[PDB]
Design a protein around this ligand. Structure first.
Ligand SMILES: O=C(O)[C@H]1O[C@@H](O[C@H]2[C@H](O)[C@H](O)[C@H](O[C@H]3[C@H](O)[C@H](O)[C@H](O[C@H]4[C@H](O)[C@H](O)[C@H](O)O[C@@H]4C(=O)O)O[C@@H]3C(=O)O)O[C@@H]2C(=O)O)[C@@H](O)[C@@H](O)[C@@H]1O
Ligand SMILES: O=C(O)[C@H]1O[C@@H](O[C@H]2[C@H](O)[C@H](O)[C@H](O[C@H]3[C@H](O)[C@H](O)[C@H](O[C@H]4[C@H](O)[C@H](O)[C@H](O)O[C@@H]4C(=O)O)O[C@@H]3C(=O)O)O[C@@H]2C(=O)O)[C@@H](O)[C@@H](O)[C@@H]1O
Lengths: 381, 381
């Protein structure tokens, strides 16, 4: 029985059971995953402090990125204030090292923690712990538990909480830290410091103005906010708060954001409307991984108005079959492969065999190193 | 008469003449351009050596970039060899600093040299000179005169010349250096070093295997190769070679790439077929800016096979009016504003009033800081 965390616990337990029983398909699969994971054992742990351009706090431990759709205005002498081009990512985002480094850290810690849970090999806990300590708790290298300067925008006058959605890149690693508890490498002192960091980060996201505003967002930002919220809460073992968040925030959001025909109108008005419809449901999918570990199925549980997330999948399913049929603005091609895990997660939760079959028909590559696909051998045959 | 260089000499001459006569509309325009150019006066000159990851030569003065559409293969343990996804730019390109630094250098040197030509103010030549010396001729900071490691691809076994097309970002700056000849800041020694660098770069692109291959390319690479060739040759005042390149290479190559309906089949098979159809003609446009200064009009002179570049504009013109009508793959939106200067250049060269009218109707913003628009007050209202 897997510890509470941000993953499909059923697939992880099934993998760990079959690996321990010596089943050959799984054992061979885990040996490939172990060869993929070797680069993470070697990898020097990253830190948010590895930047030259400092945030307005002057603190290198404050996370800071550029909001991706904001560009210099060439008709202004200094390019200020920046203006928005929805769906067009400003390559200036890559000047903020934590944008990609949070992803690299998150990939490394997630892969290593999952492999330590499956195999029991201490070398994976040791490396996972080294990534965790440097990113989160180190008194010089760890990030401050806030997202004050996430997705800042040059020239913008008002505070926004929009950058909080960046947190999903390290909050999954926070959740996976639970899997290395009880190893020799993760000491009681390591756990306390991370518990304290997670408590401070949870306080910030629940009580800061930016956190409050993001918690009330009318589109996929509010859904992702609560998915991140559940990762922090599950890490801290606050299962009653997970129940409260699901009933008092996630379900009302679903009832409000799904229209009667199952479309997501807030995502339909975006220039990448098929991507953002899918991204909304991906937030629910990762939230559901956590709630269903305590008996709450977000795919089939109605809001007060009777709407259910399965209605959102039904609306999009034909377009996952044929993205070319999509009738709203989508100014870059849609990657059909993201529907694999999503249709599998929703399909199993709903007992919809047609969703599961489609997920397997789309599939994932057997040998892919994409760390989010580790639990999904079921999609790789 | 303006020196031979990579610009619309007719518009530059008209700007300098009206500025010197004190015409208010032009005088006000140049004062805006001077405010825009102030950042280039202050800006620290860039160098190709400002990289940590060195090229296989171990020489920081060797230019190196990643070919943009090549991505790690996630089904390989080390991601090697990279694989191609046409039209999808891999953000790893921004890890090679000279990719964007060549752009920044090119903008600053072009703007400063043009403003010195128009205004005669020594401060623009002095700053222009500082950028040229550091980028090109400095014995520690200047780039080696080759493109051996331009658009390298990890894991790729064969040499390619495809990265030569990067050169357009600094070959325009090379060409405008002619505009500061005779200033106090550009000494006879500065000229000799740049002449010698340009001679060596001309030798490399004509005689290296990579240069030979790029010169033979059947698509827009071959057109840009010759546009760059003409910038170098014009910088060196080799007017006889310019005529020979125009007559014996550009026109046959342009003629070979135009189908019977005026489409460019090599560009139609790209995932960004409207962008690359336009990019092919932009090569011809910058080439024609140089050829027409010695009496050779590339828009109206037929090739050996009877094809003429005006046929390609005629094919694309309706789609510049309405880009949404384009019927070939274009997996990102097309920037209609790119058609303004193209239709003006071709329209003026062809005496086609309908092209010129559309060029002005699409227009360019009066206050834009885009340095390539500096000569085009005629498009700014
Ligand atoms: O690249 C990444 O970091 C990930 O991006 C993910 O998409 C996020 C972005 O990072 C932004 O946060 C983006 O914010 C949007 C809001 O969702 C919203 O559309 C907002 O709209 C405002 C608008 O700014 C303006 O003020 C107008 O007048 O009103 C609008 C309104 O309220 O309707 O604009 C924000 C913005 O662009 O700043 O949103 C997305 C998101 O929806 O999650 C994601 O694509 C991920 O895959 C990337 O990895
Ligand atoms: O990002 C930038 O620096 C600028 O990019 C400009 O577009 C260039 C690219 O930089 C690449 O060089 C790209 O190279 C293409 C070739 O044009 C060609 O399509 C080639 O196709 C090959 C293919 O690689 C393969 O070997 C196959 O079997 O055969 C194909 C064939 O010959 O048909 O692939 C190259 C590649 O992608 O490596 O081409 C463009 C270009 O056409 O100029 C430009 O977009 C500019 O705006 C950017 O600033």
């Amino acid at each position: 029985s897997a510890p509470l965390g941000p993953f499909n616990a059923t697939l992880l337990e099934q993998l760990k059971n079959d690996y321990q029983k010596g089943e050959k398909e799984v054992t061979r699969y885990i040996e490939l995953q172990e060869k993929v994971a070797e680069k993470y054992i070697k990898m020097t742990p990253l830190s948010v402090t590895a930047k030259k351009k400092l945030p307005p706090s002057k603190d290198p431990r404050d996370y800071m990125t550029l909001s991706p759709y904001w560009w210099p205005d060439s008709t202004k002498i200094d390019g200020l204030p920046y203006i928005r081009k929805d769906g067009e990512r400003n390559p200036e985002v890559y000047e903020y090292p934590e944008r990609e480094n949070a992803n690299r850290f998150g990939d490394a810690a997630y892969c290593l923690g999952v492999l330590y849970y499956i195999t029991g090999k201490e070398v994976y806990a040791k490396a996972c712990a080294n990534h965790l300590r440097t990113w989160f708790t180190d008194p010089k290298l760890g990030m401050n538990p806030n997202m004050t300067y996430a997705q800042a925008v040059p020239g913008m006058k008002k505070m926004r909480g929009s950058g909080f959605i960046d947190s999903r890149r390290f909050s999954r690693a926070l959740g996976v830290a639970k899997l290395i508890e009880g190893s020799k490498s993760w000491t009681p002192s390591d756990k306390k410091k991370l518990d304290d960091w997670a408590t401070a980060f949870c306080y910030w996201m629940e009580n800061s103005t930016q956190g409050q505003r993001e918690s009330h967002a009318a589109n996929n930002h509010g859904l992702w906010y609560e998915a991140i919220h559940l990762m922090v809460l599950a890490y801290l073992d606050r299962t009653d708060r997970i129940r409260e968040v699901a009933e008092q925030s996630i379900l009302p959001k679903m009832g409000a954001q799904i229209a009667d025909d199952g479309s997501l109108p807030q995502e339909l008005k975006r220039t990448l409307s098929l991507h953002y419809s899918t991204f909304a449901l991906e937030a629910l999918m990762e939230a559901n991984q956590i709630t269903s570990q305590i008996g709450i199925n977000l795919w089939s549980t109605p809001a007060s108005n009777g709407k259910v997330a399965s209605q959102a999948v039904d609306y999009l399913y034909p377009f996952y079959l044929n993205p070319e049929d999509w009738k709203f603005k989508q100014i870059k091609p849609f990657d059909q492969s993201r529907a694999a895990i999503l249709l599998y997660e929703a399909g199993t939760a709903l007992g919809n065999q047609k969703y599961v079959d489609t997920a397997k028909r789309i599939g994932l590559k057997y040998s892919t190193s994409d760390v989010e696909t580790i639990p999904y051998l079921v999609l790789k045959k």
